[PDB]
Amino acid sequence: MEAVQNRIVEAAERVPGVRGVIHLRARYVGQDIWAHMIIGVDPENTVEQAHEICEAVQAAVCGKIRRIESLDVSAEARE
Amino acid sequence: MEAVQNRIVEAAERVPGVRGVIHLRARYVGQDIWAHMIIGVDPENTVEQAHEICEAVQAAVCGKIRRIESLDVSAEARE
């Protein structure tokens, strides 16, 4: 649980435009993980750019961590 | 319930920068309402601007509809 959540955080942080993981809640459903994540982004990015970063984080994390079967990613301004 | 939710929607829509209410969930707790709202915004607004619109919607709706005692507002790109 703690190691998998570190893996998730690190995976998100390596995606262009991510300025920290603000929040991550992981729920275990059988052998699978269902998760909700909030990432920080540049406040001067557009809303469209922030959506693109969130989509990229979803693809990267789901592609890298095969136990994850649901992941919702949203963004907030950071710095 | 239906009339109060129409009131909430209309109140949000009159705030500068709102492009529709995408989602509104209202829960009744005793006599009070607790609500979660997603607004549409210009995709070319910055993330900081979208946060400012959300804050303005929170102030307007909470100020106008006194039964609401909790309101969380987030934004997504619309058009």
Experimental method: X-ray
CA nearest B46 in A: which residue?
Answer: A46
Q: Resolution, in Å, please?
A: 1.5
The DSSP element (H or E) to which B40 belongs, if any, is strand B32-41
Instruction: Enumerate the β-bridge partners of residue A23.
Output: A38
> Do residues B62 and B35 touch, judged by C-beta distance below 8 A?
no
- Sequence ranges of the domains in chain B: 6-77
CATH (residue range A6-77): 3.30.70.1350
**Two tokens, residue A51:** 């959506």
| DSSP 8-state class, residue B68 | E
Interacting residues of A1 by C-beta distance below 8 A, sequence separation 6+: A26, A28
Closest-CA distance, B26 to chain A, in angstroms, reads 21
Helix axes A2-13, A47-64, angle to 10 degrees: 130
**Two tokens, residue B71:** 């309101």
Chain A positions contacting chain B at CB under 8 Å are: 41-48, 50-51, 74-77
Residue A2 is which amino acid? E
